[model samples]
Target: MHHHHHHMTEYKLVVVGADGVGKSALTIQLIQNHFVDEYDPTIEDSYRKQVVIDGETCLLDILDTAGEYSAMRDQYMRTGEGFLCVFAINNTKSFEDIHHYREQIKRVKDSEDVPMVLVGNKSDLPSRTVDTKQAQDLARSYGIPFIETSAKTRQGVDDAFYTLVREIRKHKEK
Candidate 1:
């Protein structure tokens, strides 16, 4: 199936993140365009969700991998057009893994202009393991937009994805 947008262009996005960072949950929320809490955890393979954004038909194919296990980690390192690297604000390990995740995704992306967003999920959690300043600094070092977002509440969620699309479009001169 195909979808046409006002710009007559189709774009694909792949949400890649470690397990429990809300990859599949975000996929369901964004693609179904609704909210629910009972999504089954992502397994070995990946799931795909498609939605229209800013008059463009966007296809979001998400791969939620088990970051702790090397076998599952290998599952999604090579997929997606651009990636949203999700790290849990409350989990220190998740934040530290962003460097590894970024490095791996960089190896897979075709170009630097692919537009990866460093997403700090679960922003509602007040006592975060990762501080905002650290997140911003990491984003600067990696040269990507760093933003804190709550997937459950949709805080900064739309802006992150839409801004990323705009970034990619801007680079393409679309």
Candidate 2:
């Protein structure tokens, strides 16, 4: 008797937000499972790992994007299977800027309906300028999932990624 093993499915996920919004921190925390308490800007960083999610083993390719690179946004958006559109809960400007990032992703992908999750990061902070209701309302208006995450505390970080992956899988199934 011969047995065959299924190959792992590969999914590309991009993290996007304004500068100083913890995009790198969130991606690093997801890939490395550790937290760093410093701010280091990212030009473009990619991490790949195989992990089991919902009883299926697959490869996750996470892209930690640079906020300064407007020229490469289209390429990143075009390549990603799903996106974690992130913003800081303490930064109202970052939350407001999510609109432009989401719109750009849509325009670049040429699909208004893309697999995405609206993430409000830095939930551990005591000073929050963006309210949960505001984020939820915006996500509801856009028809996407809203999640609050704190990379410092590792709260909801995995859930955010998993939710986005599940959403991507659903899109591919259809």
Candidate 3:
């Protein structure tokens, strides 16, 4: 059964990471249920998904973005309710840059207590450069949840967003 919509929440989730960490691929997998195999520079793309997380219906406005050429990043950071700070497991440089993006988002938002999740993307790769323990420790330091996802295998993709949605709800109430 369905009821008239009135109290559905809108979660503005911004995805940020290094240029080649498959950040866009993760977003595309979630939005379009497919992976991009080539190097495509995404200027910006907004995808919407309506999901009932637990019992509440949420409209997630996901902003898929690029790494370098960050002129528009400011606006998205300001408007986004939650963030997915992603890094590739195989790319150590991408992992190192996650802190930069997180700090920048905090700076722009002017809040240390922002709702975000630290995502270790491309978990399907066996030759892992960034260890899970290291990433988990960093997330623990950030006081946020850490997730490993593979846009290739589609693992932990949904849970990452769902956890952030829950984080947003917690932030909203707290």
- Among these predictions, the greatest TM-score belongs to 2
lDDT tens string, model 2, 1-174? 111135778888999888788898888788874454655645677888677999988889888988674676677788898999999998999999999988888888888779999999999998899999999999999999999999899899999999998998888877
Name the lDDT value of residue 22 in candidate 1. Answer: 71
Candidate models: Cα lDDT each: 0.67, 0.86, 0.85
User: In terms of TM-score, which candidate is stronger, 1 or 2?
Assistant: 2
lDDT by residue (37-107, candidate 1, tens digit) is 56576554455555566676655545545555656343355535456788888887878877777777666
User: Between candidates 1 and 2, which one is better according to lDDT?
Assistant: 2
For residues 11-115, write the lDDT of model 3, one tens digit per residue. Answer: 889988887787788877777644545545467787887889998777888888775576777888998888999999999989889889988998999998899
Model 3 regions more than 4 Å off: 1-7, 33-41
> How would you order the candidates by lDDT, starting with the best?
2, 3, 1
Q: What value does the lDDT take at residue 121 in candidate 3? A: 92
The local lDDT score (0 to 100) that residue 107 gets in candidate 3 is 92
